[PDB]
Design a protein around this ligand. Structure first.
Ligand code: CDL
Ligand code: PC1
Ligand code: 3PE
Ligand code: 3PE
Ligand code: NDP
Ligand code: PLC
Ligand code: SF4
Ligand code: SF4
Ligand code: SF4
Ligand code: ZN
Lengths: 339, 154, 116, 207, 48, 176, 56, 46, 96, 156
């Protein structure tokens, strides 16, 4: 590397960080924060987008003049992928979807597309590669979402050997579908939960921690070929977590039990709409899948990030669900000890 | 900066000719309209002593009856060679100030007519190249003019 | 003599520190409802830490005229917050949330830039 | 009369010169220096303790009647021990004449507020405080008037940078407008325009 | 122009263009200067 | 001299009082205001059919910038940086060096059309009429970046509007 | 100025004045947009003698 | 060798320009207006 | 007179072109590189050398007030042509 | 014959409605607001294109930032932008709202409204002529005319 784009400045908006990053799937929940932190330091962020340009406008104020470059691409058009990665030094793959469409399904977005990005990046000459997977990824799970990520996770590690795979748990934030999803059950009266929300342990992680971890992995060369797992600082029962969410939102809470087979059936009629499904058969599985406890995988603390307690920043997400402007404290959710 | 282009003072005359009727139509809609009067009469009354002590100037003084205009008391340019009247209010409220401005729009047409009829010939910027830049024709043939053009713009 | 100077409010430090303490009291009692009225996302604990931290920085002062101005400015700052002239953005400009940490050790500065 | 030279007014110069001595003799306790410029503007330089006695005198005295505060501004001259210079511009409708009254202060020394003399000075003194940092005693309401809430510093002081210290942008992570240290895509280009050759020998200073 | 036609020059565009904003023909800025500092290129021959 | 605007005292005779009473009850002066708006309904509107009709301009108009050439193809700019030094907004950046043939010419000439105040001082200070502001005023963009002109963009503007820039200078160079 | 005499009567009557002699639209009384070239005067200092700068 | 030519008023100046207020006096008197108003009512009542 | 580089990018009249491993070529993906094709160094070299009978000639660029400041060029050096510093037009002396 | 064709004409209808009924909310801040009013004056008459002179934030489809944005005003601009129902566009008018302008190096001016809100059209000038803004408003219309919201939805 005789060029080695050299950082300049104090790390501000007009500075140069030397990072030329292509961020696929930059138009979603996780992309907003990743692109924001890159442009907040002076990175050249290429944002290949499939949606309408009107939906990329929130990404324009995130960088200085000319530091955010927008391109068109198709997940099945390798030529378009190459155009957006050939001039870069790090590729970030944040592509995903909670549901399956006629054109695209879980295999296409979690296996066929991520592999193409890695294969094109490898020959294009990209030295770094960040791939996001799920904490509960295995090829022996009811969820087809989680089954596909395990299949697609290994292809990235076999197509781009040095890639850095990050396996976050459920992420919560302002635009998340995890804590907002819980608070939006109120449109149907009670809150269905397999069992009574018991027998499920989850370790939610803050969106910014996932973002800072992704950014740190783009800097320290002790993450090439590694595999991380971003998990929160506390483990909660699903029943406790949902009750806490409704406590912050300050709304009636009437949980009732529901059989697993019955939950899927209502989860199939809610995935008939041709728009954003309110819930799906796959989405119900992931809510109740206890988060793994992989202790052999390095986590956030190794990359220099300190996991953010949910109690610290749960009001931030659930404020808008409160029906009163001010509302005049909620006791912390019962957390499973470390033992 | 530059002299007036040929055929401008004719257009100003054509415009100034019809502008009195335009103000008349403005007064047909507001001066004697009872809704306008009730929203501007006895509103914002200022005394002549408070107006002076609060730093007011212009119509904010003349509205309250103070007879003061810097064009007639401290003239500049050629304002002492033109004829015009200074409208003065009596009540000191919004309505009287609205009348002064309307009358000032008339007295301004009065001054423009005199300016068009008394415009003298000659240069339009001081003939002193150490203050005002020389003409481009001189700047491209005279060494001194080019030196002063260079310095006055750097 | 030349050292003679016109006071602002307080003629000596002991009378100047009374104004400082009165100003810490009003600030200490305004954080609770400043975090409520503005709908901030910071606990009242770290709110009073920020008030405490600001005062401590101007603790080496030993000139009553300097201290009187620091008190005068502080009450101007307090009035803006009490009367909600400040927006949520102004109140959170003390905490520097979006400024990345800048390590102060020599080696860290050596790798990043030329600044001392 | 040369067409490119401003004509003199010797009548005004003599009149304002006489009125300067008149004010100096009636207020020896405060008037430190009186000047009349070549374009006939009288400047009365006073001790800072004499803001109210002199402004009140010029406003009320039957031969002065300066009943209009045209402007009130400060000038920052760092070389001076008292770096600030408070300038009061007064107008007289009765006598159709103007006067200027100048005093001085520094960062830590209060100057008496003239709101009791001229109500116009209410906002002028807030601007001087906000932009220069001069504190005015007994002011009905002293605050920042022109600068952003919480702005730290006094922009019009000569040692304050042109582009400031902080700049604003919207941050999506916190969903609010945030302030960060100033960085400029193009630095302001400082021009050294002064010519090394003297231009006005009449204003030459001693060696 | 059918009465007082413009002067003809070699470099004047024969074909006019409209506002090309939003199209692939838009104007993308760049620096028109060359690199200022030339780095040292180490020898490709080993030693010892 | 001065004139009172509102010093008239209303008449207090029977006819005058009954005129104001009739005005109050019968709304006469309000009807007088309805007639004026009715008049405007039957006048010709002053609206021009944009973009098929354009508002009148003059040869002095200060619009988009351009870099000119002599009647030879050679650039008029000789990198004197007088325009750079007078730009009130500091919207010009110039770098120069001897050309291959030894001619004093620029290697960079950037105008930041977002700092520019469209004031005309650059074309007043140019001793060779190199930089001018043309009549074009319709060059709105969808991105901020493409309003940061470099030498190539300005030269293209000159080669694109020269037929019109030359005629305007011809119609106004005897004033300037 | 193309309004028929009937509409002209109506607008004139309603306003209360002759609107046809003071139209707010310009037709042909405006100066031609092409004018003969000028030849501007020169200032008082354009002399070849008795014109030393220190005297002005 | 033509003479000076700058924008000047035509020899003799421009025609007079009106500026004073010209609000006309139009309508009937207060007496007549009430007469027509009362006349309408009586005919209407009839 | 462009001299397109091996990577297919036009070289402007100032010699500016992006190297292979330069990340700033990405800005031209989906767009174009604005380059003015009329090089002033090629067009002024194809202007005939004027022949004059005087050792000194004056150039004002043509047009008088519309040209450039009037300069006087010397022509006593036979080994080279006299060049104008503003416009580049060249002048030679007939025989002496 | 194809769902792409049917979903495309139905997309033109919504584009045509949104392009032909733009209701701006002018943020008159500085001198450029004067040239924005001249766009509503009789000569140009923005109202004839379906562009109403003035509307409230919740009834507005486009924000026109006409004038200088200061550090003390920036928080208010974003608040009104957030409260604007979607779809919402921004037109940046004048040098001050584009890159700071004459006041670029000031300590109290935001160097461009694009640091605060996304910008769809930039109108250059100081001030842009009332006709130059109307060109910018008519250029925003062709942007909406070129949107493919329903096309892109049909191919997800
Ligand atoms: C209510 C009564 C409406 C009367 C119709 C309008 C009319 O005749 O006005 C012309 C004319 C008055 O108009 P003007 O302002 O004096 O003429 C201005 C220009 O000369 C006129 O400008 P111009 O010389 O350029 O005229 C050209 C114009 C001429 O167009 C016309 O002649 C309009 C006639 C419409 C009938 O041609 C057009 O533009 C055709 C456009 C048609 C628009 C649609 C009008 C009809 C709509 C009917 C409803 C739909 C069914 O008629 C009159 O003298 C008074 C009309 C009222 C008395 C009506 C008695 C019957
Ligand atoms: C159709 C509207 C045409 C408008 C014509 C305007 C006009 O001529 O004003 C003349 C005049 C202007 O009146 P004036 O307010 O200017 O004063 C008139 C009185 N002297 C003479 C003392 C000044 O308006 C009228 O005369 C209208 C008469 C009243 C009509 C309304 C009656 C009440 C409504 C009854 C139900 C209908
Ligand atoms: C009708 C009255 C009349 O004709 O005027 C008679 C007389 C003359 O009035 P004059 O000299 O101008 O000055 C006022 C003197 N008192 O003026 C008078 O003497 C009358 C003064 C008293 C009038 C009182 C009015 C009370 C309200 C009734 C109004 C009647 C008019 C309305 C009807 C108009 C006609 C239809
Ligand atoms: C619709 C608008 C609202 C309803 C009114 C409709 C009637 C419009 C009234 C217009 C009056 C009018 O004609 O004004 C013009 C005319 C000016 O003529 P002139 O007096 O000669 O002016 C120059 C004098 N130097 O002025 C006149 O000559 C006025 C002659 C008409 C008088 C109208 C009758 C008197 C009005 C008061 C009585 C109201 C009750 C009428 C009954 C209504 C029920 C039908
Ligand atoms: N957010 C969460 O809760 C969790 C996220 N993850 C992982 O993070 C990644 C997604 O994060 P998140 O932001 O929440 O997802 P989002 O639903 O918010 O957005 C998904 C992104 O991927 C793009 N996308 C989806 N399908 C396609 C397609 N065929 N072609 C091109 N782009 C497509 C979308 O583009 P567009 O919409 O514009 O068409 C969008 O930019 C995934 O890898 C996921 O496994 C892991 C743990 C928790
Ligand atoms: C069938 C489901 C319901 C929709 C009904 C059909 C009308 C929808 C289109 C309206 C907008 C439109 O037509 O716009 C105006 C168009 C011009 O558009 P263009 O530039 O040629 O567009 C080409 C493709 N673009 C959009 C990418 C540029 O003029 C017309 O052709 C209008 C004439 C037909 C009107 C019939 C009305 C019924
Ligand atoms: S018009 Fe004025 S502000 Fe714009 S580039 Fe020229 S000198 Fe600078
Ligand atoms: S454009 Fe004109 S003023 Fe500017 S550097 Fe070139 S020759 Fe000099
Ligand atoms: S761009 Fe020009 S007209 Fe607009 S606000 Fe700024 S200085 Fe005023
Ligand atoms: Zn030449």
């Amino acid at each position: 590397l005789h060029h080695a784009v050299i950082p300049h400045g104090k790390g501000g908006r007009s500075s140069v960080s030397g990072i030329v990053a292509t961020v696929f799937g930059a138009t979603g929940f996780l992309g907003r924060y990743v692109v924001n932190h890159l442009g907040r330091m002076g990175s050249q962020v290429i944002v290949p987008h499939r949606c309408e340009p009107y939906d990329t406008m929130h990404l324009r104020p995130m960088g200085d003049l000319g530091q955010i470059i927008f391109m068109d691409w198709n997940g099945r058009d390798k030529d378009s992928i190459r155009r957006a990665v050939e001039h870069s030094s790090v590729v970030i793959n944040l592509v995903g979807r909670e549901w399956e469409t006629q054109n695209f399904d879980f295999e296409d977005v979690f296996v066929k597309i991520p592999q193409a990005i890695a294969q094109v990046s490898k020959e294009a000459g990209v030295e770094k590669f960040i791939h996001i997977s799920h904490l509960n990824a295995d090829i022996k799970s009811s969820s087809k979402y989680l089954r596909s990520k395990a299949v697609g996770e290994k292809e990235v590690r076999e197509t781009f050997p040095e890639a850095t795979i990050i396996k976050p748990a459920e992420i919560f934030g302002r635009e998340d579908r995890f804590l907002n999803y819980f608070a939006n059950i109120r449109w149907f009266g009670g809150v269905p939960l397999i069992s009574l929300g018991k027998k499920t342990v989850k370790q939610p992680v803050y969106i910014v921690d996932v973002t800072k971890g992704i950014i740190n992995a783009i800097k320290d060369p002790d993450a090439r070929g590694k595999t991380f797992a971003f998990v929160g600082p506390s483990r909660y029962l699903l029943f406790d977590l949902v009750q806490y969410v409704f406590a912050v939102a300050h709304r009636p809470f009437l949980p009732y039990p529901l059989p697993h087979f019955a939950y899927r059936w209502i989860g199939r009629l809610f995935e008939i709409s041709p728009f954003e499904p309110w819930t799906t058969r796959d989405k119900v599985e992931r809510i109740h899948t206890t988060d793994k406890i992989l202790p052999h995988l390095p986590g956030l603390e190794d990359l220099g990030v300190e996991a953010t307690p949910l109690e610290l920043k749960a009001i931030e997400v659930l404020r808008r669900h409160r029906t009163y402007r001010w509302l005049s404290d909620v006791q912390p959710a019962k957390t499973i000890p470390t033992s | 900066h530059q002299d007036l282009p040929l055929g401008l003072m004719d257009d100003i005359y054509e415009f100034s000719k019809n502008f009195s009727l335009r103000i008349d139509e403005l007064e047909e809609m507001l001066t004697n309209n009872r809704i306008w009067r009730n929203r501007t009469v006895d509103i914002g009354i200022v005394t002549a002593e408070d107006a002076l002590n609060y730093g007011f100037s212009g119509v904010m003084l003349r509205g309250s009856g103070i007879q003061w205009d810097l064009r007639k008391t401290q003239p500049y340019d050629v304002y002492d060679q033109v004829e015009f009247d200074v409208p003065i209010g009596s009540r000191g409220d919004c309505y009287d100030r609205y009348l002064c401005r309307v009358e000032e729009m008339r007295q301004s047409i009065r001054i423009i007519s005199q300016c068009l009829n008394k415009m003298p010939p000659g240069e339009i910027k001081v003939d002193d190249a150490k203050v005002s830049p020389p003409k481009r024709a001189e700047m491209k043939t005279s060494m001194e003019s080019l030196i002063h053009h260079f310095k006055l713009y750097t | 003599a030349s050292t003679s100077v016109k006071p602002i409010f307080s003629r000596d430090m002991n009378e100047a520190k009374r104004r400082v303490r009165e100003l810490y009291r009003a600030w200490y009692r305004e954080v609770p409802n400043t975090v409520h009225l503005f709908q901030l996302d910071i606990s009242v604990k770290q709110g009073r830490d920020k008030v405490r931290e600001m005062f401590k920085k101007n603790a080496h002062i030993t000139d009553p005229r300097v201290v009187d101005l620091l008190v005068i400015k502080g009450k101007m700052e307090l009035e803006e917050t009490i009367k909600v002239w400040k927006q949520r953005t102004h109140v959170m400009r003390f905490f520097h949330e979006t400024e990345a940490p800048r390590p102060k050790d020599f080696l860290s500065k050596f790798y990043v830039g030329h600044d001392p | 009369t040369r067409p490119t030279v401003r004509p003199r007014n010797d009548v005004a110069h003599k009149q304002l010169s006489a009125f300067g001595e008149y004010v100096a003799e009636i207020l020896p306790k405060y008037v430190q220096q009186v000047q009349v410029s070549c374009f006939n503007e009288l400047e009365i330089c006073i001790h800072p303790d004499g803001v109210i006695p002199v402004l009140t005198f010029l406003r009320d005295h039957s031969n002065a009647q300066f009943k209009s505060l045209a402007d009130l501004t400060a000038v920052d001259i760092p070389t001076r021990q008292n770096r600030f210079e408070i300038v009061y511009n007064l107008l007289s409708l009765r006598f159709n004449s103007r006067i200027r009254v100048k005093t001085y202060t520094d960062e830590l020394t209060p100057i008496e507020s003239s709101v009791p003399v001229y109500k116009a000075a209410n906002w002028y003194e807030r601007e001087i405080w906000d932009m220069f940092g001069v504190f005015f005693a007994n002011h009905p309401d002293l605050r920042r008037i022109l600068t952003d809430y919480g702005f730290e510093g006094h922009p019009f002081r000569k040692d304050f940078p042109l582009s400031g210290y902080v700049e604003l942008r919207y941050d999506d992570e916190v969903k609010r407008v945030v302030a960060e240290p100033v960085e400029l895509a193009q630095e302001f280009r400082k021009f050294d325009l002064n010519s090394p050759w003297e231009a006005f020998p009449a204003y030459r200073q001693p060696p | 122009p059918t009465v007082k036609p413009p002067t003809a020059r070699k470099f004047i565009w024969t074909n006019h263009k409209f506002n090309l904003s939003g199209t692939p023909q838009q104007y993308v800025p760049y620096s028109t200067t060359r690199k200022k500092i030339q780095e040292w290129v180490p020898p490709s021959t080993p030693y010892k | 001299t001065y004139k009172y605007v509102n010093l008239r005292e209303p008449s207090m005779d029977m006819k005058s009082v009954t005129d104001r009473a009739a005005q109050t009850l019968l709304w006469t002066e309000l009807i007088r205001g309805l007639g004026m708006t009715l008049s405007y309904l039957f006048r010709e509107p002053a609206t021009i059919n944009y973009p098929f009709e354009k508002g009148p301009l003059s040869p002095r108009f200060r619009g988009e910038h351009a870099l000119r050439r002599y009647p030879s193809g050679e650039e008029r700019c000789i990198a004197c940086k007088l325009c750079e030094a007078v730009c009130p907004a500091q919207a010009i950046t110039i770098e120069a060096e001897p050309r291959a043939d030894g001619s004093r010419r620029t290697t960079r000439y950037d105008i930041d059309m977002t700092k520019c105040i469209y004031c005309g001082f650059c074309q007043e200070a140019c001793p060779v009429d190199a930089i001018v502001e043309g009549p074009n005023f319709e060059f709105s963009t969808e991105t901020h970046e493409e309003l940061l002109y470099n030498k190539e963009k300005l030269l293209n503007n000159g080669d694109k509007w020269e037929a019109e820039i030359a005629a305007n200078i011809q119609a106004d160079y005897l004033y300037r | 100025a193309s309004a028929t005499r009937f509409i002209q009567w109506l607008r004139n009557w309603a306003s209360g004045r002759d609107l046809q002699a003071k139209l707010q639209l310009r037709y042909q009384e405006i100066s031609k947009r092409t004018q003969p070239p000028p030849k501007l005067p020169v200032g008082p200092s354009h002399k070849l003698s008795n014109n030393y700068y220190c005297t002005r | 060798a033509s003479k000076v030519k700058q924008d000047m008023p035509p020899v003799g100046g421009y025609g007079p320009i009106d500026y004073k207020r010209n609000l006309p006096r139009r309508g009937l008197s207060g007496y007549s207006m009430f007469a027509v108003g009362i006349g309408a009512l009586l005919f209407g009542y009839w | 007179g462009v001299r397109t580089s091996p990577t297919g990018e036009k070289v402007t009249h100032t010699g500016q072109v992006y190297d292979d491993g330069d990340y700033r070529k990405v800005r031209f993906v989906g767009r174009q590189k604005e380059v003015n094709e009329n090089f002033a160094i090629d067009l002024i070299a194809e202007q005939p050398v004027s022949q004059v009978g005087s050792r000194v000639i004056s150039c004002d660029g043509g047009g008088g007030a519309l040209g450039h400041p009037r300069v006087y060029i010397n022509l006593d050096k036979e080994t080279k042509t006299g060049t104008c510093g503003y416009c580049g037009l060249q002048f030679r002396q007939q025989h002496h | 014959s194809r769902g792409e064709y049917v979903v495309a004409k139905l997309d033109d209808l919504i584009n045509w409605a949104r392009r032909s009924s733009l209701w701006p909310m002018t943020f008159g801040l500085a001198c450029c607001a004067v040239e924005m009013m001249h766009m509503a004056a009789p000569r140009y008459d923005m109202d004839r294109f379906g562009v109403v002179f003035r509307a409230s934030p919740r009834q507005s489809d486009v924000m026109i930032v006409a004038g200088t944005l200061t550090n003390k005003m920036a928080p208010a601009l974003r608040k009104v932008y957030d409260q604007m129902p979607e779809p919402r566009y921004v037109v940046s008018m004048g040098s001050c709202a584009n890159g700071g302008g004459y006041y670029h190096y000031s300590y109290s001016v935001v160097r461009g409204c694009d640091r605060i809100v996304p910008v769809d059209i930039y109108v250059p000038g100081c001030p842009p002529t009332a006709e130059a803004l109307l060109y910018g408003i008519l250029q925003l219309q062709k942007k909406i005319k070129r949107e493919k919201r329903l096309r892109i939805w049909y191919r997800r």
